[PDB]
Design a protein around this nucleic acid. Sequence first.
RNA 1: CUCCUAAAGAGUAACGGAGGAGCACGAAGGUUGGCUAAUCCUGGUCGGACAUCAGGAGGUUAGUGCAAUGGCAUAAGCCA
RNA 2: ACGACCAGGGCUACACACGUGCUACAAUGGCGCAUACAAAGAGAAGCGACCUCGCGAGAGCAAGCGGACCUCAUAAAGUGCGUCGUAGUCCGGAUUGGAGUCUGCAACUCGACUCCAUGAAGUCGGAAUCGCUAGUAAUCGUGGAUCAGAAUGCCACGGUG
Lengths: 114, 79, 177
Amino acid sequence: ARIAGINIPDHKHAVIALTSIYGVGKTRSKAILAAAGIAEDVKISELSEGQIDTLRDEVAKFVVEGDLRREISMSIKRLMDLGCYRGLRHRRGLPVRGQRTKTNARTRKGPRKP
Amino acid sequence: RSLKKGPFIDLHLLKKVEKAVESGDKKPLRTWSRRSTIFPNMIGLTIAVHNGRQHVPVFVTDEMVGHKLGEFAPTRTYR
Amino acid sequence: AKLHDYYKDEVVKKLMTEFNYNSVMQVPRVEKITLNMGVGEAIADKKLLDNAAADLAAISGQKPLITKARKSVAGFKIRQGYPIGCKVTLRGERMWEFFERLITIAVPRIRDFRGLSAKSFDGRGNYSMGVREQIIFPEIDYDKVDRVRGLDITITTTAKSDEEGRALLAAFDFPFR
RNA sequence: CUCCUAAAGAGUAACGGAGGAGCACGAAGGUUGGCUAAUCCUGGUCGGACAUCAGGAGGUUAGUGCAAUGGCAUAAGCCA
RNA sequence: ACGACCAGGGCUACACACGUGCUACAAUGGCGCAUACAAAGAGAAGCGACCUCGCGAGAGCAAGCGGACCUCAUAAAGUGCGUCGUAGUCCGGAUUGGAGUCUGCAACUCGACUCCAUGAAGUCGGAAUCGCUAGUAAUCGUGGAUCAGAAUGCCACGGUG
């Protein structure tokens, strides 16, 4: 159905359906299903509404939703406004973690332009 | 990414910072220790960090604590 | 007429002293809620505009009014008289039964809610805000969604200034960031 | 065909100064009922200088199947 | 001084072009649990078990081993069961944010690794072009040199074939 994470997860195995939330991967999905009491191989259908309310109550413990997007934007903005090395690498769309820029920077640089 | 057994700072820079804060506002601190960590008692001072040829003036703010000094002095020129 | 009844008994006498009005007729009112859906891209195909207006028909229970282009402009390459968007104005209790339907259901649904702005006033006491998603309403089901088109909502009040305007919706517990 | 030359009735020439027409429409005709612009400002999902929405300013600076002139709110303009 | 010492920086840049590789685009596959079968090597400022703590990288304690004895060291493809059911997906892992570990005087430029989160391109590749004839190609792991740390490279080893 729908979760406190607005997003609407698909009707499939709960462990994989909960991954559709921004901020919930496989490990956090397994942890949510374990702390809630729901099996991992059960679909989102066949789940009572009282069980979805339980899943919401558990996902409320994590910062996983536009809130997390806001915290990531805040960190990158702090880096850019600080003017440090990583801030400059973020400003110019260049790799931040020491990767080579002579070749192979296509994820940060995008499609090549002559 | 240094262990959690305490941050690193060069001793000469540490003593320079204590002498600068105990003696009131001073001139920029000329240093070559780009690897030193910015500590909270350096907030307010402007440290001139070497970048290879010059000493780049860096006015320290509370948002810089935890960074290394060389993070605010680029070493390569690109236009 | 929940907030409608809540209007004539509660928010009038707190406002009557808040601005020290001499007559009850001086208190601001809420005339109409008009929902606009500017399609813009219906010129490519008009099969999508009818179902677009079908959504707006389900949000308020009123058959929408298809607006036409007032004049030809090539900047968006339309000739005057083309079906460009639909709209619905709501008055009376159908406005009220909708006015609570969002403030108590339309508020707690928007993704990454941060609260409404207090600066989005016309300057003479009328509020307007736009919702980006249409799946925020209970009526429109997520299963049946061909597009994610939003819509604008403006609040027409008899208030004379924004201060009297913001004071009225604040009495209805409006989220003001 | 329209304006000016044309000398405040009409008319008035030049290889004088400027523009148009050789159609369109069974509704763009008749009638009854209703309606009132341009532009700009402010606010507002995508939406931008410019789309649709709301409000204020403004008062016909708009509109009139087409040139110009004279008209047009009782609208001759717009809708059924 | 074109000699010598030092600190910091650079050799790691980045519109772009090429060579050589690794990982993929998936179902002859991904994931989960269970389980089978190697060879060749290295080790004393070294390899470091067992046990305890940690989600993990690792940490503490502390045997044995100059080694057919001890350690690295659990081979992996495979096989059994379950699931996914052709979707940019339970494919793919880039990139980025946060939190850490270890080496090292010191991980900013500019280390490796771990955890959480995110989830680019990519759905088999134009012209053209390469290797390979049998335990070969293809594919799957393992070890060593250099080395404080830093292998998708190099050199070697076996499994299926």
